[PDB]
C-alpha cells in the first residue's frame, strides 16, 4: 500500500471537472485521495481507502487510475527512464455536473427535507448516463483519511446507518414501479393491435380472477362517469382497473415478451458498474397478471431500468446500452479508450413508441405542473407503488419517468423517492415529478 500511494493516482472527471483526484502530501502514504463534492458524486466515484479498498469507478477503473493498466505500460516505462514523477490515467465519465447537482439538490429539498431514493438521467440517443444520484449519500473523504480511526469510525457509522448511504439505489436496488409500468402494459396491448381508442372499464373496483382479492382505482372512484373510457384517457388519468383489465386482456405471454423487450429479466451489461437485474416476475396465474399490469406483485425495477424505458421510447423504440465512462486517458491526457454508442435492441416499433410518446405527453398534462418548464413539452408517466409486507399501511414509493422535449428528446429521467418522504399520502406527481422536472430543466440549459 505504501508503493501504491507513493505514485499519483489519476482523476475521475465529469464535464472537465474533478470528482476524485490525488494530492501530494507529507504523509507516510504520500498521496491523499480528495473528493471535492463528496456526497453528490459518491454513487459515481465510490471511495478509495487504505483500510477498506475501493468501490464504484475507483474500483471498476482501478488499473487505469493507478497506472497498472497494460495500455499505460509504455507511459510508465517512459516516466521512469526520464525521471518523471509517475502518474495514473484519467477516467472521463458521462456525467453532466449540472444535471447531477440539480438531481442531488432536488432530492435534498424535495421531501420537506431530504428524500431517500435515486435520480438517473440518460441521453436517449447515445445511452450516456448524464446523472447518477443516490440519496442519502456519504463522504468518501472520510474513508480516504490516512488516519485508521477516522476510516474505521466512518465505516462503522455507514454500516450501522439504517438508511444505508453506501447503497447506490440507482443501480443496486430494485423497487415495484407501480403505475409507471402501465407504459409496458400499454406497449404490449398496442403491439398486439389495441389502439388509443380501446374501451376499458371505468369501474372503481375490479375483482381479480380466481381470488377474493380486489384492485381499486384511487381512491374508490370511477375513472369517469361513463362505464368505459378510452385507453388514452385511462392512461393519462392512470386508472388502475382499466389496466388490470387491459393486461389480462393482453395476457401473460405478451406482457412477459414486452417486459423482456424493454430489458427486464435479462442480465444487464456493466456500465462498468454492475446493475441489479429488474424483473416482471413469474406471473403464475391471472390474479398475478392483474397486479402485474399496474406494476405490483413481483415486478421490480432499478431506477436505471425505469429511465431506460423512458429513453427507449424517446429514442423511437431503440434502447442504447447505458454507459458511465466516456473515455479513459493517460496522464498526458492522451486518449486510450473512447466508448462508442451501440443499440442493445428494439423494444417497440417506431409507431408504437410514437403512440406511447403521445400518451405520456398527455399523462404529463394531467399531472400537477409544479416544476413545469416554460414552453417545454415533457412526456411522462407517474407512479406511486406499494411495497413491503404491509403495503396499504406503508408509505408508497413515488416514481416519475419522463423525457424531453417529447418532440425531439435530449434527456430521459427516472426519479424514485423511496418510501415517499416517509409520508403515506405520497404520490409520484406530488413528490417525484417536480424533482424530475428540475433535472430535465438542468439538462436543457
Ligand atoms: C399506479 O401505480 C396507481 N397507484 C396506485 O394505485 C397506488 N398503489 O397501488 C399501485 C397508490 C397508492 S397511493 C396512490 N396515490 N396510489 C395510480 N398512480 C397515480 C399516479 O400517476 O401516480 C395516480 C394519480 C392514480 S393511482
Curated annotation (Swiss-Prot):
Catalytic activity: Preferential cleavage: (Ac)2-L-Lys-D-Ala-|-D-Ala. Also transpeptidation of peptidyl-alanyl moieties that are N-acyl substituents of D-alanine
Subcellular location field: Cell inner membrane
Its EC number(s): 3.4.16.4
Alphabetical list of InterPro entries matching this protein: Bact_Transpept/Beta-Lactamase, Beta-lactam/transpept-like, PBPA_dimer, PCN-bd_Tpept
Effect of residue 381 to G: Cannot rescue the deletion mutant
Gene Ontology biological-process entries: cell wall organization; peptidoglycan biosynthetic process; regulation of cell shape
Main enzyme class: hydrolase
Entry domain remark: The apo form can adopt multiple conformations. The beta5-alpha11 loop near the active site is a flexible region that can adopt a variety of conformations in the acylated state of PBPA and appears important for acylation.
The family this protein is said to belong to: Belongs to the transpeptidase family.
Protein name: Peptidoglycan D,D-transpeptidase PbpA
Origin species: Mycobacterium tuberculosis (strain ATCC 25618 / H37Rv)
Amino acid at each position: 500500500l505504501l508503493d501504491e500511494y507513493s505514485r499519483q493516482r489519476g482523476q475521475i472527471t465529469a464535464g472537465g471537472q474533478l470528482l476524485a483526484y490525488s494530492v501530494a502530501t507529507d504523509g507516510r502514504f504520500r498521496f491523499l485521495r480528495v473528493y471535492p463534492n463528496p456526497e453528490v458524486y459518491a454513487p459515481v466515484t465510490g471511495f478509495y481507502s487504505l483500510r477498506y479498498s475501493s468501490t464504484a469507478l475507483e474500483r471498476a477503473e482501478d488499473p487505469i487510475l493507478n497506472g497498472s493498466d497494460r495500455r499505460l505500460f509504455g507511459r510508465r516505462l517512459a516516466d521512469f527512464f526520464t525521471g518523471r514523477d509517475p502518474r495514473g490515467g484519467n477516467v472521463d465519465t458521462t456525467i453532466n455536473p449540472r444535471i447531477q447537482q440539480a438531481g442531488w439538490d432536488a432530492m435534498q429539498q424535495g421531501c420537506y427535507g431530504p428524500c431517500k431514493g435515486a435520480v438517473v438521467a440518460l441521453e436517449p440517443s447515445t445511452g450516456k448516463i448524464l446523472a447518477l444520484v443516490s440519496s442519502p449519500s456519504y463522504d468518501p473523504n472520510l474513508l480516504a483519511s490516512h488516519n485508521p480511526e477516522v476510516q474505521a469510525q466512518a465505516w462503522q457509522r455507514l454500516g450501522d446507518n439504517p438508511a444505508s448511504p453506501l447503497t447506490n439505489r440507482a443501480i443496486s436496488e430494485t423497487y415495484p414501479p407501480g403505475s409507471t409500468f402501465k407504459v409496458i402494459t400499454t406497449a404490449a396491448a398496442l403491439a398486439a393491435g389495441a389502439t388509443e381508442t380501446e374501451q376499458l372499464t371505468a369501474a372503481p373496483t375490479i375483482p381479480l380472477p380466481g381470488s377474493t382479492a380486489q384492485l381499486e382505482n384511487y381512491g374508490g372512484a370511477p375513472c369517469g362517469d361513463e362505464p368505459t373510457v378510452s385507453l388514452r384517457e385511462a392512461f393519462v388519468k392512470s386508472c388502475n382497473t382499466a389496466f388490470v383489465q387491459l393486461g389480462i386482456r393482453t395476457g401473460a405471454d405478451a406482457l412477459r415478451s414486452m417486459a423482456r423487450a424493454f430489458g427486464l429479466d435479462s442480465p444487464p451489461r456493466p456500465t462498468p458498474l454492475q446493475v441489479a437485474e429488474s424483473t416482471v416476475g413469474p406471473i403464475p396465474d391471472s390474479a398475478a397478471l392483474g397486479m402485474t399490469s399496474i406494476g405490483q406483485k413481483d415486478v421490480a425495477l432499478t431506477p436505471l431500468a425505469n429511465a431506460e424505458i423512458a429513453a427507449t421510447i424517446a429514442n423511437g423504440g431503440i434502447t442504447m446500452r447505458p454507459y458511465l465512462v466516456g473515455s479513459l486517458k493517460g496522464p498526458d491526457l492522451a486518449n486510450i479508450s473512447t466508448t462508442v454508442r451501440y443499440q442493445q435492441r428494439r423494444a417497440v416499433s417506431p409507431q408504437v413508441a410514437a403512440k406511447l410518446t403521445e400518451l405520456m405527453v398527455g399523462a404529463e398534462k394531467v399531472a400537477q405542473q409544479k416544476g413545469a418548464i416554460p414552453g417545454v413539452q415533457i412526456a411522462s408517466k407517474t407512479g406511486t407503488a406499494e411495497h413491503g409486507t404491509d403495503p396499504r399501511h406503508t408509505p408508497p414509493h413515488a416514481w416519475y419517468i419522463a423525457f424531453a422535449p417529447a418532440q425531439a428528446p435530449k434527456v430521459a429521467v427516472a426519479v424514485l423517492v423511496e418510501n415517499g418522504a416517509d409520508r403515506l399520502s405520497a404520490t409520484g406527481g406530488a413528490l417525484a415529478a417536480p424533482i424530475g422536472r428540475a433535472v430535465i430543466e438542468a439538462a436543457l440549459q
